[PDB]
């Protein structure tokens, strides 16, 4: 057998069924909570470029799409669930995706605005603003995906083991 020594900067993507991610249900008129939480695993470094695709595909408990006036906001945080204004990306509305062809089509493929980085212990949150008198989010059917592996279109999330590279700490301090 033979396998190629693939580069440390591995091309990956994020989704629900992973250990360093979590979600929880949401009601209405309810900005403060992360519907979805992400955290940096230990001794790893994640990198999200500016042209990274984004793809929330939330649902209602009865299996429906929500009010497109709903808003989604990805946002970096300092440790301790402490958000920060700078570094925010993807302040979008829940409408205007066409989930059918969303990831499928590079046109519909909504990318981020600016670059981003996740040091080994950091947080990225996904806040949601639903107008009142509306249905709530259901975590069983909701989903997030970011990055585009497995396609000549779109970009992919970079990852690297912190212990391999020597300037990994330099890039971590650089943020």
């Amino acid at each position: 057998p033979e396998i190629g020594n693939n580069g440390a900067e591995k091309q990956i993507s994020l989704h629900k069924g992973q250990p360093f991610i979590d979600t929880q249900d949401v009601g209405a008129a309810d900005p403060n909570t992360p519907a979805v939480t992400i955290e940096g695993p230990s001794d790893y470094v994640i990198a999200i470029d500016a042209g990274t695709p984004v793809a929330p595909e939330f649902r209602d408990a009865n299996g429906d799409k929500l009010d497109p006036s709903t808003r989604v906001t990805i946002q970096k945080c300092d440790k301790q669930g402490n958000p920060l204004g700078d570094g925010i990306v993807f302040s979008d509305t829940l409408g205007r995706f066409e989930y059918s062809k969303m990831r499928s089509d590079p046109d519909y493929m909504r990318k981020t605005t600016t670059s981003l980085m996740i040091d080994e212990r950091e947080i990225v949150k996904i806040f949601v603003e639903v107008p009142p008198n509306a249905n709530g989010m259901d975590a069983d059917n909701s989903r997030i995906t970011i990055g585009d592996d497995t396609s000549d279109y779109g970009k992919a999330v970079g990852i690297v083991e912190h212990g391999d590279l020597s300037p990994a700490e330099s890039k971590a301090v650089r943020q």
Partner: protein
């Protein structure tokens, strides 16, 4: 010298001997080996490259029900369900999300729609009481991966560390260049060495049923490879 072939879950360039299929396991969630390909005597070597070689893998499962006097026209399932690349509509999909067959009435059974949120599906027909039924819905909530074996059942490495979910695999529209799937990793092996394609998921998939209308072999794999003669 070098060519670019396709290889399938049966026969093909190999000859049905140095393939082997297998089902998964349900109660112990374990990284089973559902398929494996052993490089035959005649070839020199086989290569495999990501972002170069396309792929397709349509799995399913099997379930059954029991006819009743009440007009069911709907069945629950034990597997998470969604449409083929997303749509509420049937017959627009690249392929049917689900197929049903009646043992008594040896005929196909159409599908109207489904909720696609809970483990649900509609039937267009009205099954009779006592009639036996089979259904081969889409499969979900799984992981797929590769590994190599050096003639002995003795692993040496792994093509790509991180598994890709079959869920996502169904989600992307297949067989479109630019949107075609292309995993990562660059493997290569030689005579009598094996590549195993492995599955980690709860639901019991299938390969053969002998009573499935849309072809004999229910599921399928079709992978691109490079060969040195």
């Amino acid at each position: 010298q070098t060519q670019e072939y396709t290889i399938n879950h049966t026969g093909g360039v190999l000859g049905d001997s140095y393939v082997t299929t297998a089902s998964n396991q349900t109660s112990p969630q374990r990284e089973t080996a559902v398929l494996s390909f052993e490089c035959p005597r005649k070839f020199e070597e086989i290569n495999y490259v990501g972002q170069r070689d396309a792929t397709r893998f349509v799995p399913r499962t099997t379930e059954s029900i029991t006819g009743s006097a009440n007009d069911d026209t709907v069945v629950d399932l034990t597997a998470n369900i969604q449409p083929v690349a997303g749509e509420e509509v049937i017959a627009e999909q690249d392929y049917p999300v689900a197929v049903a067959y009646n043992v008594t009435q040896g005929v196909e059974v159409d599908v109207v729609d489904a909720d696609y949120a809970a483990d649900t599906v509609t039937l267009g027909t009205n099954p009779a009481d006592g009639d036996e039924v089979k259904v081969w819905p889409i499969m979900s909530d799984g992981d797929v991966q590769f590994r190599l074996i050096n003639q002995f059942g003795q692993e040496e490495g792994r093509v790509y560390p991180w598994s890709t979910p079959l869920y996502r695999w169904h989600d992307f529209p297949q067989l479109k260049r630019g949107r075609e799937i292309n995993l990562h990793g660059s493997a290569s092996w030689s005579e009598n060495e094996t590549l195993e394609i492995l599955l980690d998921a709860p639901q019991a998939l299938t390969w053969e049923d002998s009573d499935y209308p849309r072809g004999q072999y229910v599921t399928t794999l079709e992978q691109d490879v490079e060969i040195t003669l």
